Design an enzyme around this catalytic site. Structure first.
Site, short mmCIF file in Angstrom:
data_model
loop_
_atom_site.label_atom_id
_atom_site.label_comp_id
_atom_site.label_asym_id
_atom_site.label_seq_id
_atom_site.Cartn_x
_atom_site.Cartn_y
_atom_site.Cartn_z
N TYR A 181 -104.35 -74.66 21.93
CA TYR A 181 -104.07 -73.43 20.87
C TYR A 181 -102.60 -72.82 21.45
O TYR A 181 -102.15 -72.70 22.40
CB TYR A 181 -105.00 -72.49 21.21
CG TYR A 181 -106.53 -73.14 20.93
CD1 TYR A 181 -106.83 -73.49 19.54
CD2 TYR A 181 -107.36 -73.01 21.73
CE1 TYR A 181 -107.97 -73.97 19.10
CE2 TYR A 181 -108.52 -73.44 21.64
CZ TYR A 181 -109.14 -73.73 20.21
OH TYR A 181 -110.21 -74.58 20.07
N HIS A 223 -102.97 -74.81 17.45
CA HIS A 223 -102.53 -76.29 17.16
C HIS A 223 -102.66 -76.35 15.45
O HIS A 223 -103.33 -75.50 15.01
CB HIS A 223 -103.31 -77.14 17.96
CG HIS A 223 -104.81 -77.35 17.83
ND1 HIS A 223 -105.59 -77.02 18.86
CD2 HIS A 223 -105.56 -77.44 16.62
CE1 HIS A 223 -106.77 -76.99 18.44
NE2 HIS A 223 -106.88 -77.06 17.23
N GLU A 229 -104.17 -72.91 13.87
CA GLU A 229 -105.32 -72.30 14.05
C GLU A 229 -105.26 -71.62 15.63
O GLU A 229 -104.42 -72.13 16.66
CB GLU A 229 -106.66 -72.83 14.24
CG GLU A 229 -106.76 -74.25 15.06
CD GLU A 229 -108.11 -74.75 14.98
OE1 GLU A 229 -109.05 -73.91 15.44
OE2 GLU A 229 -108.16 -75.84 14.42
N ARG A 268 -111.55 -67.99 14.45
CA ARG A 268 -110.11 -68.18 14.63
C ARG A 268 -109.32 -67.86 13.36
O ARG A 268 -109.94 -67.29 12.43
CB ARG A 268 -109.98 -69.86 14.45
CG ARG A 268 -110.68 -70.86 15.17
CD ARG A 268 -110.16 -71.19 16.43
NE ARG A 268 -110.92 -72.08 17.39
CZ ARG A 268 -112.11 -71.70 17.96
NH1 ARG A 268 -112.34 -70.54 17.90
NH2 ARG A 268 -112.76 -72.92 18.51
N1 LIG Z 1 -113.23 -78.61 11.37
C1 LIG Z 1 -112.02 -78.78 11.36
N2 LIG Z 1 -111.59 -78.92 12.55
C2 LIG Z 1 -110.19 -79.25 12.74
C3 LIG Z 1 -109.40 -79.19 11.32
N3 LIG Z 1 -108.26 -79.34 11.82
C4 LIG Z 1 -108.09 -79.41 13.07
N4 LIG Z 1 -109.46 -79.40 13.65
C5 LIG Z 1 -109.65 -79.41 15.14
O1 LIG Z 1 -110.54 -80.52 15.53
C6 LIG Z 1 -111.77 -80.02 16.30
C7 LIG Z 1 -113.04 -80.57 15.91
O2 LIG Z 1 -113.53 -79.77 14.94
C8 LIG Z 1 -111.84 -78.67 15.94
O3 LIG Z 1 -111.96 -77.79 17.31
P1 LIG Z 1 -111.17 -76.61 17.13
O4 LIG Z 1 -110.84 -76.23 18.62
S1 LIG Z 1 -111.88 -74.91 16.73
O5 LIG Z 1 -109.86 -77.39 16.55
C9 LIG Z 1 -110.53 -78.23 15.48
C10 LIG Z 1 -110.03 -78.91 10.17
O6 LIG Z 1 -109.46 -78.90 9.17
N5 LIG Z 1 -111.28 -78.88 10.13
#
Ligand SMILES: Nc1nc2c(ncn2[C@@H]2O[C@H](CO)[C@H]3O[P@](O)(=S)O[C@H]32)c(=O)[nH]1
Ligand SMILES: [Ca+2]
EC number: 4.6.1.24
Length: 104
Positions: free
Chosen positions: A38, A40, A58, A77
């Protein structure tokens, strides 16, 4: 009253601004923290109707009040863009699997 309510977690605008500044700073320096790197790119597969332009990034916001520095990121997030504009506050809480829902 909460400015953002993620499940049971309550955040103020100050909580969000503090978290965002940290994550944006790291983004600017090209550095990451945590095993899931993070901040990312957040792709917005959910298709939230954000008022600001992509790309989105995020960064975890913690109910403890501390700035994320590694370890478990929790379910919440803050999503910001290239111009450090807040796109929104999202959470895994109340959402199926690894999906997200907006914090009200
Ligand atoms: N659900 C979701 N996950 C995303 C997206 N873009 C990136 N991710 C990443 O893909 C992983 C699996 O959902 C997530 O763990 P996270 O650490 S909160 O970061 C998320 C998005 O648009 N939706
Ligand atoms: Ca707080």
């Amino acid at each position: 009253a909460c400015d953002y309510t993620c499940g049971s977690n309550c955040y103020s605008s100050s909580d969000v601004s503090t978290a965002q500044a940290a994550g944006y700073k790291l983004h600017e320096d090209g550095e990451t923290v945590g095993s899931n790197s993070y901040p990312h790119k957040y792709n917005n597969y959910e298709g939230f109707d954000f008022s600001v332009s992509s790309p989105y990034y995020e960064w975890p916001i913690l109910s403890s009040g501390d700035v994320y520095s590694g370890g478990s990121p929790g379910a919440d997030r803050v999503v910001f863009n290239e111009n450090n504009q807040l796109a929104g506050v999202i959470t895994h809480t109340g959402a199926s699997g690894n999906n997200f829902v907006e914090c009200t």
